[PDB]
Symmetry: D3
Subunit: 244 residues, 6 copies
């Protein structure tokens, strides 16, 4: 069975057995490396195509993977597709950052995304120009909240907006987003939840409020480190509670 | 203060104080009447404009309202808007029915809707042609699941599709919906969740699988009665657990 | 032939023979009841599912039906579909109300709708995203005008706008509608004319200007009663002139 | 007042007073010439920019104009705009041809267009992506039918589809058009009715069924001449009945 | 072979052999006539249906055709389709005019169109609602620039915007066009480049800046004559360099 | 001037002076590194945020940069925006790969992209839902062709399709693309050309045909190396010919 022994994907160079059932994914592959090296035991780097580093190790006796997805729906969707099909990964926790768009949401809040609005056309293309509701797996959402209830993290459970556009002419659309309940803006949650729906996989996303777009305030580099730690402690706790 | 003493809305003829903080809404105003008369104590019919009956009574010492919303997003949205603004209702439980579109979903399953896809243009109009994620309030979603865990009801927590179209030429779009995880098809959940987002209100929807569109099977009238009872016992239990 | 003897639809509980060839439909089922009880002889209530009351009686020796369609295109379309197929009703007169959007249109004007613009996606879905022209049956339109010429009613023959949205943030879109000739705004005319086109049925709509959105003026309750009477006298006169 | 004495438009080189209140417009400027020279007395050619010939003469003591509009909505709209503004023409009769798309419509039928569907984006651009109902002036529509009732012409009063596309890969969309009541396909009626709505002008369109797209049959050249004559006799009769 | 001996198209009445391999097309058929009569030897008028004049003659020993395409994408597309199929014309040079929308572009500049944006729906209809890039044939583009380098003409190589709308309410969209690099506005370049893509034909467009929409300035009639001459000298030079 | 001395962007950690006027960008940052280390002299790695490596060095006495842009329009657009604004880079050569969709295009062909179609919504969002023509800078396009004419590379100058979707259900849309002249499919050319239009920058893209989607054939790893070398020799030759 050489064809299968040597099987990989165009964007991942891991052998087929290399990933855990559960994966944590930030956008930044260097953050994936920092996470794996800091929190996991017996770590192996399993993929590095295009510098998109992925790792598998153990946490408290459970196999866990960590890998970058890159920026934006089209990049993220490629890795989600390949992981959910070829590599048979089941559970996905996006560990992200977002920008707040209203003073009621504060720097250092942790958003647990029930759903994700978007300005991508990808779902319209696949879904006959209907509005696709991109939502989290309930069990993973609930596990996140149950872990968070045991912490001092200020968290919010609601919707994000996943945009193709990092740069925009002005803040007018941001005010409209806030009017209709959007808690923060980022780029890959809608893609994760949509890919998970297609592939019968389970997904949730945590997004630290690292920047306040409306208030023009930003966490320091050190503050980002602190809040990353809070989010990873939560994510790993959730991973440990998922069935095997 | 006569103007306020006599205030009402064009589609609701209740005085301003007439509703509870929490309302159960089926599509059918006669079902609202059956529910109020069966389950509530000290019931008052508070509105009847256009035959769209609404009621307020008590259950286990808590004030509860029950009212019909009619069929389809544009009808339902009118009542949601008026209730969430003028009448200051906070919490909404849609108590609905849906059609299943895949053999994995069974007649008598109870769908707890995390989100709702749609084919309405209403959100595109209000949201600059972006994709609006219409999702449930987490706390109400979780309370539903926590109540359901104490029962023998077969329930599923996932997405519905809210269509403007009851009648369609064929089942092709239904197969696409199922491919991407849609559990059932109905008409008003997306509108409820979208109105709740606009108005900072809290909403969830329960939908009994009363019909299987793909399998061509249907609950009997008596079976519908049975499953209605299961859903109302759950909804009232959730209402009692909500803050006051 | 028991299956046919007992045939009905999910939203109408009338036997198959219960309706006339010609039906008058307001949105409000209680208005349908008022009309039937006031103007028709030998009246039978033939349907009451969801409180959506329908009636059949006689006027000047001709069988006439009257029934509510509910609010908005998706609700109205369901009843139109079921009436035009299962119950084989041929001729439809929507007897409605609308809001004016320019001072040239006056309270108490009666709009005879040649056509209906819309913001619904329903026609785009069925019509390959083309612009569907939703227009009246000429013979019924002409009969309306020929009856109206024998009265003192101030009437206008032109276009309405059928919206999914009763509530809007501001009057900007209303000014655009008026710029391009829209005479009034309501919710179900486009659906009626589109269903009639699909089903080879004949339709027209009369809409009393009961409210002036731009001028912020409204008919009194008594004035609404008066203008209803004028519209029903016209509609019944038209029904009597239609072929049998 | 030299600026006004010499005023014209970029696509019409007539002095400002040169047109009648009522204009007949075919697509083909050579047909406009044939019509003017055959039917009108005291004819003057008033414009010839780009070969788009226009004429003014008298019929039975009334001033009448005749001018080509060219092919397609963007060409036709330019001439309609300039005529309805600068030259203050009030009444417009498009005298056109169309292709039938169902065996129920016959070669030599004359379609009187109540409305016109389309695949142009022009109205969506001007009308906030709503569906604009492009319909005829009722009085002109009724005058057409009243004249036609005095003839042996087989006529139909209903909807046309105005397409940007003369050439299409196959007849699939044509079958959809017929399913929803479209009587014939042409290119400029929607533009005429939309321009007339914008400019408070009065318009109607007559379209001879000269070709049957579905049946693959075509009028001979001589037959086209015959049916042109029938349509012009009707159009001129209608023009004479319009107020001055 | 009488059927082929007598073959023509509904909008062109030329025999099948009547056109050259290379055609120059302005919008205005009278300009086509002026060009043919001024520059070509041994000229024959080969078509005149609807006044849309076309000609074939010789320039410096090469056969060249010249013909009008009319105004707007739907008119132009018909002639392009018929020429590129039935009449087997290979090379197309649109010789047009455009309006400038920014002070950096000057009256008398000659725009060589690499590409053409648009507001037509025609490509969306044919191309599954994707964005079709309508671009020039490289070899013809390069030949244009190589000829222009030998002149004193101020030329620019970039993008035009082909609109269905000659008349617009204001200049807001024009400022957006300029923000994103559009050099001038006209109506038929996108259609030419799209038809050429469909039919494996080779196309380029030259557009004289005859009007400055933003600056409100216009070439005189005599100046238009001068710049026409410059453009035709360039176009004919390019035609002579194309393979046979 | 410390604020400017220390200025950088959220996705690039280079000092402001670190880039050349001209940059070569593949998707893969490891390919950028291979290119810089193989072809450039005096190389400095100037940025490495998120592993998105960029470099500046010299080739034949000219400063040249090389940097990865990541996968897909939203990722690529971020780097293009930051380079074209903050870092004042003027000239951009995308050095990419694409998949062919028709047997007429061969493995190892080098496509020089005049334009790029797309299925992204990004341009529709910024451009009022018009069709934006995303095209190359003519001078850079011509320099590419003039260099290629001096080689044995089989090259084609035409259009690519830039998709958000790497994975699709079937090849139906690919056949439509080929019908209308698309030479290959990739993900970032449209974004590059659109960003360059916004920012008055100059761009071109070369895409090696490394895979044939329709024929199901693929270059070997060694063959990819060979064709990369051919493309870089061309790109550097073009960079040397650009003004300073």
């Amino acid at each position: 069975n050489l064809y299968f022994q040597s099987m990989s994907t165009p964007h991942i160079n891991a052998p087929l057995d290399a990933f855990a059932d559960t994966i944590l994914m930030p956008g930044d592959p260097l953050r994936a490396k920092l996470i794996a090296e800091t929190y996991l035991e017996n770590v192996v780097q399993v993929t590095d195509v295009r510098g998109m580093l992925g790792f598998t190790g153990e946490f408290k006796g459970r196999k866990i993977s960590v890998m970058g997805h890159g920026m934006g729906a089209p990049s993220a969707s490629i890795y989600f597709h390949e992981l959910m099909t070829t590599y048979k990964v089941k559970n996905f926790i996006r560990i992200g950052s977002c920008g707040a768009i209203h003073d009621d949401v504060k720097l250092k809040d942790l958003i647990v995304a029930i759903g994700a609005s978007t300005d991508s056309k990808m779902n319209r293309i696949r879904f006959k120009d209907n509005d696709f509701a991109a939502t989290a797996n309930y069990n993973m959402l609930s596990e996140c909240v149950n872990t968070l209830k045991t912490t001092d993290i200020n968290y919010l459970v609601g919707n994000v907006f996943s945009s193709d556009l990092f740069y925009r002419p002005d803040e007018e659309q941001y005010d409209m987003m806030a009017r209709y309940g959007i808690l923060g803006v980022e780029m890959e949650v809608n893609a994760l939840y949509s890919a998970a729906a297609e592939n019968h996989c389970n997904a949730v996303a945590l997004c630290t409020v690292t920047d306040h777009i409306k208030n023009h305030e930003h966490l320091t580099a050190d503050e980002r480190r602190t809040e990353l730690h809070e989010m990873i402690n939560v994510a790993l706790d959730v991973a440990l509670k998922l069935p095997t």
